């Protein structure tokens, strides 16, 4: 077929945040990065003033401000995942605000292994060069000494082929990089000087040939001290020529440090963040010697408080810290002079909604209005939540544990959620929870009592997951019941359906027994619950010999996948599950969809297998299959012939049954009829619409909290839009001067093919926001048709979301 994609919710997760002077030399700006979108604020003494929020045809991977010789205000270097590199400047004609691309180019190298620690992009303190570490063994060098409008670069060879982290050093004569690398004999810190004259490296000021085994962060101390702070799992070490000051703060050995921001321009206070929301301050204790020089007396570490799990940190001013988060909400926090009752200098002074990651969702008409709200399993760990999204307004239900699957049971006016809680083995000989939370604090609770299975030298500190079924009220969003599953039992599927001639509507939960020793899951359980007098009771459990990866109601029966078997189940008069038929495949049935009597099966590797339940026979019959190996994360039935899916990397794709029933080999194979680079990582596909020329409505959530709609198009429509897209691409200006077609082109790790059978509604809809002079230019000469009739057509499309 032909399909149309449109953004219903921009990405909300923050992936990077820099503080500089982009709008004018006298303004403190905060630039924030959310995958495709750039956001530019001004830091007032009252808070954050919005200024401009732009869209890039790329995924922002390097975002850094810098001020080269002969520049009034800072400039912005962005580097995208598809290796697009630009330098941007701000420009406001009194009222008109544009982000002009001063330089651009694709820095990709025809050959080269992508480095494991990923794209690193640094800028020399004297803005002499931009450093790029894209591929193991090489180092690209964009000279800034002159107008490198085209970002002409050169690739210095580098013998250390596993560099962890690398930064330019301060206070040194010739440009110097400082890097942590690993080889057979360990992890080591080395420097080199960058000779542009000679276009290769020369010896460096200093080296240390055995540093902390898991050293990961290199922080370049600024000019006053000079040097670098190496951060690792247990030690925070400082290196400069002959100075070597190393500490092991007990406080930091609870979680791993992943963030740092420099607070004072002289660099004697650094903020540090771990993966559990602890916020640390590292203070460089300085020694003011009489000779005029200064030495580093001591390194101290202080625990300030707890915030959203931080992806990036920047201090702003007046004690306000921005926290960029991807697992939870981003926030402004005020750091006070004294501590609090517990001891947190921190106090949350704002928050910003983040629906990412969207692990599961469902569409539901709570007000019986014919509209439809969307309820999401959002975030992870302490940031976990339900988000309720209506036409958009958002209500967040904090859960303080990870929601994994959600379903609506309309009969009882409640939601079923499968949730996990981390607990940690306790010195009393059990496990302790890390904090109160949904399962912990639910009005009523229950604990499974199965005895279907039988299974002390663990580790005090080892963490354990406790899986629960939550029953949340659809009006108060309160946790009514919390059922705790079996120990060592990992819940996977959730379903709310009435089955057989039974009138009760039930909660069906598919699980799997996991043990650290056994790789493949050899045993599981379909349980049947029913919620009634405020309590969840267990109706029947069918102990299976595998992992129930998916359950779907299948026209009154229950279609379950057990490992590589698609099993069909019926509800008996005696309230138990009987096995109608089995279907044994050569893949694992991770994904299961049904339209009518069709069955869609897929695994993690874009293996697709179309079954069908022959009703008179009461067995399944293979209709078609395709193997185009690649990682697949999600998959959905568009119509009885077309199928939609998300695969690596951040691509969508559609294949259809050979409608051309020609020969056996042909009819039993699915052709690839659509390829599109989305930019998000789809986690769940949900048939539905949030409203009420296009046919269909499939909504999707992603890891970055972006919500999407897909709708199927008409051969005529698709062609017409196709032209629009290109027509527009001439007038709509790219931010890195990036070609819409490059950006949308399907992109694997080792392949890149041009998109097909998809219309970028995001661009299409931009037609209504352009100038009526320009509008006419994009409509020039086609039936030519005026603007005013095309302004109508787009309006219809805006209505789908």
């Amino acid at each position: 077929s032909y399909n149309y994609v449109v953004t219903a919710q921009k990405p909300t997760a923050v992936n990077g945040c820099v503080t500089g002077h982009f709008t004018s030399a006298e303004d403190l700006n905060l630039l924030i990065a959310k995958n495709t979108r750039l956001e530019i604020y001004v830091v007032t003494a009252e808070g954050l003033r919005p200024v401009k929020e732009v869209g890039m045809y790329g995924k922002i991977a390097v975002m850094e401000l810098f001020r080269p010789k002969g520049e009034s205000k800072d400039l912005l270097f962005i580097l995208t995942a598809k290796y697009n590199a630009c330098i941007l400047e701000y420009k406001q004609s009194g009222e008109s605000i544009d982000i002009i691309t001063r330089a651009h180019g694709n820095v990709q190298d025809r050959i080269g292994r992508p480095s494991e620690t990923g794209i690193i992009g640094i800028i020399d303190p004297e803005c002499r060069m931009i450093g790029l570490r894209l591929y193991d063994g090489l180092f690209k060098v964009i000279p800034l000494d002159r107008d490198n409008k085209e970002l002409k670069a050169f690739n210095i060879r580098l013998e250390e082929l596993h560099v962890i982290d690398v930064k330019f050093l301060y206070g040194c004569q010739a440009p110097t990089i400082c890097f942590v690398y690993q080889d057979p004999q360990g992890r080591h810190v080395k420097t080199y000087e960058v000779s542009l004259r000679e276009k290769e490296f020369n010896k460096g000021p200093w080296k240390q040939e055995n540093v902390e085994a898991e050293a990961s962060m290199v922080i370049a101390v600024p000019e006053p001290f000079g040097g670098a702070i190496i951060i690792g799992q247990e030690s925070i070490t400082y290196h400069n020529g002959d100075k070597y000051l190393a500490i092991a703060p007990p406080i930091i050995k609870q979680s791993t440090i992943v963030c740092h921001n420099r607070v004072d321009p002289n660099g004697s206070r650094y903020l540090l963040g771990d993966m559990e929301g602890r916020l640390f301050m590292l203070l460089l204790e300085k020694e003011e010697q009489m000779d005029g020089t200064v030495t580093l007396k001591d390194l101290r570490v202080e625990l300030l408080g707890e915030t959203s799990i931080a992806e990036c940190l920047t201090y702003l001013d007046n004690g306000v810290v921005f926290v960029g988060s991807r697992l939870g909400d981003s926030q402004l926090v005020k750091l006070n002079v004294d501590s609090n009752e517990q001891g947190s200098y921190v106090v949350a002074m704002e928050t910003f909604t983040n629906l990412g990651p969207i692990v599961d969702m469902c569409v539901v008409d709570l007000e019986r209005q014919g509209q439809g709200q969307l309820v999401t399993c959002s975030g992870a760990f302490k940031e976990g939540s339900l988000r309720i999204i209506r036409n958009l307004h958002i209500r967040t239900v904090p859960l303080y544990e990870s929601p994994r699957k959600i379903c609506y049971q309309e009969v009882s006016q409640c939601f079923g959620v499968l949730s996990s809680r981390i607990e940690v083995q306790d010195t009393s000989g059990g496990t302790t929870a890390l904090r109160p939370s949904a399962s912990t604090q639910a009005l009523s609770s229950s604990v499974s009592s199965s005895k279907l299975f039988s299974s002390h030298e663990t580790s005090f500190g080892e963490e354990v997951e406790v899986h629960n079924l939550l029953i949340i009220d659809q009006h108060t969003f309160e946790v009514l019941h919390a059922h705790q599953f079996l120990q060592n039992e990992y819940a996977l599927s959730l379903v709310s359906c009435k089955l057989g001639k039974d009138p009760n509507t039930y909660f069906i939960v598919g699980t799997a027994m996991v043990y650290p020793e056994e790789a493949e899951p050899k045993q599981g359980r379909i349980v049947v619950f029913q919620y009634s007098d405020g309590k969840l009771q267990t109706v029947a459990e069918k102990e299976v010999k595998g992992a129930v990866y998916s359950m779907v109601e299948f026209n009154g029966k229950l279609l379950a996948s057990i490992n590589s078997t698609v099993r069909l189940y019926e509800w008996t008069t005696e309230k138990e599950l009987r096995t109608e038929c089995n279907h044994y495949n050569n893949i694992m049935a991770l994904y299961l969809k049904t339209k009518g009597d069709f069955i869609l099966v897929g695994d993690l590797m874009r293996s697709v297998l179309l079954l069908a339940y022959k009703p008179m026979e009461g067995n399944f019959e293979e209709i078609a299959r395709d193997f185009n190996p690649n990682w697949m994360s999600a998959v959905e039935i568009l119509d009885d012939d077309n199928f939609l899916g998300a695969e690596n990397a951040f691509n969508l794709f559609v294949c259809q049954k050979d409608s051309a029933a020609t020969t056996d080999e042909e009819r039993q194979h699915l052709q690839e009829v659509g390829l599109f680079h989305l930019g998000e990582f789809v986690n769940v596909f949900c048939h539905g619409s949030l409203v009420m020329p296009t046919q269909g409505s499939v909504l999707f959530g992603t890891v970055n909290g972006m919500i999407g709609l897909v709708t199927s198009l008409s051969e005529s429509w698709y062609n017409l839009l196709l032209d629009m897209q290109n027509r527009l691409n001439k007038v709509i200006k790219s931010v890195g001067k990036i070609e819409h077609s490059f950006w949308r082109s399907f992109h694997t790790e080792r392949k890149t093919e041009p998109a097909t059978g998809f219309i970028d509604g995001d661009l299409i809809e931009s037609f209504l926001d352009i100038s009526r002079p320009k509008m006419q230019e994009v409509v020039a000469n086609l039936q030519e048709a005026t603007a005013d009739d095309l302004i109508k057509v787009v309006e219809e499309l805006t209505r789908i979301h």
């Binding site: 992936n15 990077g16 991977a61 494991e116 620690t117 990923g118 596993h162 962890i164 982290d165 690993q182 057979p184 360990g186 992890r187 085994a213 898991e214 990961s216 962060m217 791993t256 992943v258 963030c259 993966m275 931080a310 992806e311 991807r326 697992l327 990651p357 692990v359 992870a380 760990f381 990870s402 990992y490 650290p516 020793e517 790789a519 493949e520 899951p521 590589s564 044994y584 495949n585 050569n586 893949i587 694992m588 991770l590 695994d603 993690l604 590797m605 293996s607 193997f627 190996p629 690649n630 990682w631 994360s633 690596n648 990397a649 951040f650 990582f681 986690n683 890891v703 790790e749 080792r750």
Partner: protein, 338 residues
């Protein structure tokens, strides 16, 4: 070549075989038509086509060429699907070939990697170690709709250790270069060294990804735990547990008889339902110290291998059996999965 090219390649005529990439086939070319081709080949691409018999096969590249008749030695490189077949007058056969696909994939967590976490992915160079390995390489599984242990079942490096550990119950021996480090290479070694029949082999060769192929080989090693007479199919010879390695060599090395016949010979502790033919001998006993007695199926008298019996009384084991891959059929005492 190119992963999905349509190339033309000459076919060694009488040669007939399943050639696993990275296997070497020794060839002696005497018919004049044949030696001609070898000549051209060796001057050109040095690659001919080994067919499966059947529309599949493998390319074989020559790395040794001695004219005495022409004597050659080729390595298998790429698998293909036959498109056409020119049986030219000469007697040689040209072939339109479609190179089957070796899909190489990134890490499962490559796309879902949290930037902040990217500087911990390098790990510093035992049950506990692999527990931590999974807890750290798949930490970002919480951002998806699947759990960590699922991703381990598709993680090449885990799959490979899983395979090594089993293969070690068959040969307390090496663990280094003993096996390759590239999933693709390792996948192909396992296939040529498992006690499987040619059909199982052909399946692995038709699998498109090294990851899918490791999962398969694991499934073979976990489900086809019984080895039967390929010929009558109604005779279990030996069971997985009884596999061992007599010397460093391995558990099913290739041995040569005085007549150039080669024998992939799986050594096992005990075999059953076999009748012994003749009196033991020692001539060319591949395992010096034991004597050999020919062994065959008690039902169809098809050749299964030999029974080795110790000459001395020192030696352990006193008896063992050698079974030749071509006689055996793996069986499940249920399909194989990708």
């Amino acid at each position: 070549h190119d992963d999905d090219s349509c190339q033309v390649i000459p076919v060694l005529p009488q040669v007939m075989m399943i050639l696993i990439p990275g296997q070497t086939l020794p060839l002696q070319l005497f018919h004049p038509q044949e030696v001609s081709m070898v000549r051209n080949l060796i001057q050109k691409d040095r690659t001919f086509a080994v067919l499966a018999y059947a529309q599949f096969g493998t390319t074989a590249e020559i790395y040794a060429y001695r004219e005495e008749i022409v004597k050659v030695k080729a390595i298998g490189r790429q698998r293909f699907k036959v498109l056409e077949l020119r049986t030219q007058s000469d007697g040689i056969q040209q072939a339109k070939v479609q190179i089957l696909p070796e899909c190489v994939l990134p890490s499962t967590m490559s796309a879902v990697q949290l930037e902040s976490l990217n500087k911990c992915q390098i790990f510093p160079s035992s049950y506990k170690w692999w527990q931590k390995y999974q807890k750290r390489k798949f930490h970002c599984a919480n951002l998806t709709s699947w759990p960590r242990w699922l991703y381990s079942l598709y993680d090449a490096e885990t799959l490979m250790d899983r395979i090594k550990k089993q293969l070690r119950e068959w040969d307390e021996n090496l663990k280094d270069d003993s096996l390759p480090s590239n999933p693709i290479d390792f996948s192909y070694r396992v296939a040529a060294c498992l006690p499987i029949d040619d059909v199982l082999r052909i399946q692995l060769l038709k699998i498109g990804s090294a990851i899918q192929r490791l999962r398969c080989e694991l499934d073979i090693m976990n489900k086809c735990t019984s080895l039967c007479c390929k010929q009558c199919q109604e005779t279990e010879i030996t069971t997985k547990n009884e596999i061992f390695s007599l010397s460093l060599c391995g558990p099913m090395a290739a041995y040569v008889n005085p007549h150039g016949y080669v024998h992939e010979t799986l050594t096992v502790y005990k075999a059953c339902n076999l009748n012994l033919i003749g009196r033991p001998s020692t001539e060319h006993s591949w395992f010096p110290g034991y004597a050999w007695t020919v062994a065959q199926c008690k039902i169809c008298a098809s050749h299964i291998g030999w029974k080795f019996t110790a000459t001395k009384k020192d030696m352990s084991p006193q008896k063992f059996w050698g079974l030749t891959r071509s006689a055996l059929l793996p069986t499940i005492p249920v399909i194989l999965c990708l």
